[PDB]
Design a protein around this ligand. Structure first.
Ligand SMILES: Nc1ncnc2c1ncn2[C@@H]1O[C@H](COP(=O)(O)OP(=O)(O)OP(O)(O)=S)[C@@H](O)[C@H]1O
Ligand SMILES: [Mg+2]
Lengths: 96, 48
């Protein structure tokens, strides 16, 4: 990890490593990498709390391979939970 | 800087505020002085 991190163009490689089955959506891959890696979430003096993880919205026309990117993030992430709004055979978003 | 202000006394901690709020709500309930009602009346009627 340390030997591969000290390369200057490591970040680009990570952007090249996101979703090899998806072609040409470089900004979406950059956003996916930022969401997977994430920032630090902080709580200054206890009183104020700043969120530290990136939320990404992939808005797109049909046939733009957003779902395949979501499955790639499911395969890649340590704890990835998939949910859907219209579908039924999935874990819900509502606590019960 | 917030820790410095808390040590100096210009700010208090959140738990100290919580216990102080509980103490003040439990102990104190003021009344308007008779001299303080006339100005309240005058200001309330000038606006209307
Ligand atoms: N840039 C791309 N690279 C590779 N495959 C792509 C690309 N764009 C579309 N596809 C393919 O086109 C199909 C679209 O599938 P989906 O990911 O389900 O589409 P979608 O983005 O979810 O849009 P919906 O489902 O109509 S809302 C898949 O077979 C993808 O592999
Ligand atoms: Mg889809």
């Amino acid at each position: 990890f340390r030997k591969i991190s000290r390369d200057r163009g490591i970040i680009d490689k990570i952007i090249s490593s996101m979703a090899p089955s998806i072609y040409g959506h470089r900004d979406i891959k950059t956003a996916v990498a930022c969401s997977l890696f994430g920032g630090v979430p902080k709580n200054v003096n206890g009183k104020h709390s700043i969120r530290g993880d990136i939320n990404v919205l992939l808005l797109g026309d049909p046939g733009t391979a957003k779902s395949q990117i979501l499955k790639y993030v499911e395969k890649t992430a340590h704890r990835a939970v998939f949910a859907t709004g219209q579908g039924a055979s999935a874990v819900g978003l509502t606590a019960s | 800087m917030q820790n410095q202000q808390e040590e100096n006394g210009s700010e208090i901690s959140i738990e100290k505020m919580k216990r102080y709020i509980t103490y003040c709500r439990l102990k104190c309930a003021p009344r308007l002085s008779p001299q303080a009602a006339e100005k309240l009346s005058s200001n309330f009627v000038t606006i209307r």
